Paper text:
Here, we report the first structure of glycerol kinase from the thermophilic filamentous fungus Chaetomium thermophilum (CtGK). Glycerol kinase (EC 2.7.1.30) catalyzes the transfer of phosphate moiety from ATP to glycerol to form glycerol 3-phosphate (G3P). Overall, the CtGK polypeptide chain can be divided into two distinct domains classified by Pfam as FGGY_N (residues 65–325) and FGGY_C (residues 331–583) connected by a flexible region. A similar case is found in CtGK, which forms extended dimers via the interaction between the C-terminal domains with a prominent contribution from hydrophobic residues (Phe422, Gly436, Phe389, Leu394, Thr437, Phe439, Gly440, Ile441, Thr437, Thr445, Leu438, Ile450, Trp580).
Subsequently, by replacing the cryoprotectant solution with 20–25% glycerol, we were able to solve the enzyme-substrate complex with a clear electron density that could be attributed to the bound glycerol moiety. In total, three different crystal structures were obtained in the presence of glycerol, constituting 13 polypeptide chains. Generally, the same extent of the chain could be modeled as in the apo structures, i.e., for residues 65–583 with an approximate 9aa gap between H18 and B18. The substrate is bound in an evolutionarily conserved cleft within the N-terminal domain that opens towards the C-terminal domain. The glycerol molecule is coordinated by polar interactions with side chains of Glu149, Arg 148, Asp317, Gln318, and additionally with Arg148 main-chain amide. The carbon chain of glycerol packs against hydrophobic Trp168 and Phe342. A similar mode of binding was described previously for P. falciparum GK, where Phe271 and Tyr135 undergo shift upon substrate or cofactor binding. However, the movement of equivalent residues (Phe342 and Tyr200) was not observed in either of the presented CtGK complexes. Of note, we solved and refined five CtGK structures, and each of them belongs to a different space group, despite crystals having grown in the same buffer condition. We observed that in the absence of nucleotide, CtGK adopts open conformation, which upon nucleotide binding closes up.
Author numbering:
A (entry chain A): 65 to 540, 550 to 583
B (entry chain D): 65 to 540, 551 to 583
Write the structure that this text describes.
Amino acid sequence: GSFVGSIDQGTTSSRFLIFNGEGNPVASHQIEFENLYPKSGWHEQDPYELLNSVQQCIDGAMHKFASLGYSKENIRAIGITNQRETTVVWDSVTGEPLHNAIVWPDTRTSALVRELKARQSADSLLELCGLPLSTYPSSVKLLWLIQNVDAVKQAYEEGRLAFGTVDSWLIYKLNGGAQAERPIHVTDSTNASRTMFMNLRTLQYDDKLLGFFGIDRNKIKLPKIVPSSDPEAFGKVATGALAGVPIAGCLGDQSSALVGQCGFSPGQAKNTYGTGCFLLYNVGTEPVISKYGLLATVAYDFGRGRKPVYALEGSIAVAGAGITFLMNNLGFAPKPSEINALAESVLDNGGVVFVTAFSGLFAPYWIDDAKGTLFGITQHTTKGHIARATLEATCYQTRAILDAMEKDSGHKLESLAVDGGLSASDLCMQTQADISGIPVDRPRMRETTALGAAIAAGLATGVWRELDHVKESIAGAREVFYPKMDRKKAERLFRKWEQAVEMSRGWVRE
Amino acid sequence: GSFVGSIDQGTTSSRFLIFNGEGNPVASHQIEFENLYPKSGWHEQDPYELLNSVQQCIDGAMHKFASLGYSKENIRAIGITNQRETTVVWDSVTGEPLHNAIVWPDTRTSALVRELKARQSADSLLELCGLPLSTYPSSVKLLWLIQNVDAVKQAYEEGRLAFGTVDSWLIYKLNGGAQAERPIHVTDSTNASRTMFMNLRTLQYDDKLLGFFGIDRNKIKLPKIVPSSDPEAFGKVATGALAGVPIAGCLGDQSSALVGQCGFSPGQAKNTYGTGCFLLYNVGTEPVISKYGLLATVAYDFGRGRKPVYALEGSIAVAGAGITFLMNNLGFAPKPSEINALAESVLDNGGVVFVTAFSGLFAPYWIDDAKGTLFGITQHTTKGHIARATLEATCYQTRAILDAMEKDSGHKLESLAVDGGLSASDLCMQTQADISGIPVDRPRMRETTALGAAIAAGLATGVWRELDHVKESIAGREVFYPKMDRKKAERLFRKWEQAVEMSRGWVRE
């Protein structure tokens, strides 16, 4: 038949997958690449490590695709999904990087954020772009680069400086960056919504936003904002095993995950578990500015006359990191599987609640003076109770964020899909269904984020006619966990958690 | 030479030691005996298991003593020290136990305690006897026995019921219970101060106290209250390897530990480490009734015209039990040695504070709605930080109790002596000195509690002439000195008290 490829360029690993018409992979290749931490809190990557990682996964996956009897001519199109915010700067003329890419967790911008928050109009940014000032957005990373690296400052003033998120860099280079007929310098609405340069409501660059950061549109090269699904805006792969294959899809990774879960209606949510959590909440065609510190962002922009769809986003710092803490810091067990086994070994949390505020707590609590705080310990408390409480902590915080999304949105939570990391813990996802009072859907096909980009590319090139056809086609280990806990009991457990959170604030003094 | 024996009858162990004139043991024998836990919170012992364990230690220790070339004729007298409060009832005529002994931690009295506190006149008890109503004192255990066992009620109403703490039971039987010329049913001032039957200031049974519990002086046989050191009041061992050897000393175990530490001056304190802590604070010859829930009790009553000495007492639930918690519950390590090593692995607590209120917190905090609460956890927190915080928790609570004792008594803390259990941890002891700002004295000779009874018996029979002779004779690592800047110690204590305050209100029912 006909297949769709997906480049999934992540924070620590790259991937290329080839999906069939029902969204199941037939060929895959993964590579872990090098992350650089020059100074403390600094996080960098060689942009060519990102591109070459990807090119190696293309070569590997296509080597098997061939063993299956297929070639690039069997690939209708490829989509791209990427770690968001990570900032790349390159020379418009050479097409070469002027500095390393600054990865989204990088904290070098700390001081620069404090100054920008003091500036006039800082209060207006949230309503314009959907995000508040912080170290994460590409805006502060790009401005920091220009202010602290003389190559990129020089480049900026000479008019040769090009900016891009990872999607733009990959698409730019894959088309044969600079030395190419019709060079492709673009970014999709989801990725562009993460810079703080784009008006969330118009999906176009906003001069009041760019003006605040001091970036002149006439002097830097910004990627053209295009839909997440387009038959031509992204061009094609120039050389290699995919030479001549069109790129037709592009989505920020967390948005791509929502698409991979078919979260297309208002109130449909996804949670992706890793070290922490990234939750996205489909809010429909009108953006929602949060009153609870949630981010307003684009879910997907599939064009074809259809309105762009927005989302509310929240994140949790400690999910898998809590299991890691139990395994390494406390030595409970040497494998995460065995941590779950300990949690399953006991019937309940034993009264234990673990407010996993290692670095304080964020949305909807925003408690900066709590640390990790463990309540309910008695002589009868064993490793299993603490393991359970650690899994429960992520479920409570997930509910707290979803509860805020409901209030922000006005849309009742209609469904929750989970992928990655701790979602593999049957106990944890069963606990999530119990606590939130909603079924929890876990796809057996695990590459949800990669599939989102394939869906985007497939829609642009008639692999799928519409979004209803995507759902029906994708829907053709346990997969759905249904609430089994007495509601009165779920509410008591959630109130005990919220009690513990409140009792945790004010620990830290300065 | 002349030696002094000491019977040390404990909650889980019995032992007999023979001390020389310098307070060092030359023969020892220890036996672990059976404790019975019928239901949850119930704790019982066969009174003959205590006596037989003890008698077996006497025989064993005297076999080693003989190999040294000595016999009973070389032992001027023996002393007895015992687990307190543990309540024994036996038949006045036969001398046999009517029920098993109810050990001090037994909580079957909880409902009966609730009723007695609701009663009128309950507010008067503390100032009379020095203790408030709780599950621990023998009074509630005896009253429970009378109300729920018909062998005792009948024995009680028939006029045959004899009551005793473990000291009284042991001395009664060792002299030959019932069928003995001159039978001895006695108890010392320290043990008698623990029942709630005795006026603390007069050292005699109080009709208002006994009346409150409904115990009739003329119907039950109570032990005669005598000094902790007396040449005749305790009689002598009737049979066995010590037949004819006088009993001349008797002290509740925690008082005996203070004596064994030579804590004879006001402001001298001791802490004995086990599963928890028992701290005693010498307050001199006039008792101090606490305003912070500390117990007022008799330190020792050495008679010979001397006036009895009183103490303030406090206890901590989690000391050694905290190490056990790290080892077994959390699997940090398999041996206390290694838990200590982990705590030594780090330079400080890492910001971690462990309010070890597994069963709430007692004096001076009295927080009944807290549980164990661990603060300060980050991704940089390791087993060593938590192990350190666990040792620190006992030091912080030790200081809080000592601080309350100073305020109650008005006597400045002069010294702190430690024995048993966690006192072997140099780090814990050094941290205690750092936090309390006072030297911590740990005797190299380990049987501090047994020595106290030997001192009592030795004083009564001129092995030692005076307390100055006791001190000098025994004095013939050991001290931990504060090495932490007071500024840092006060910050650490303030973080602990912050954590304690942040812990209250956890339990909602």
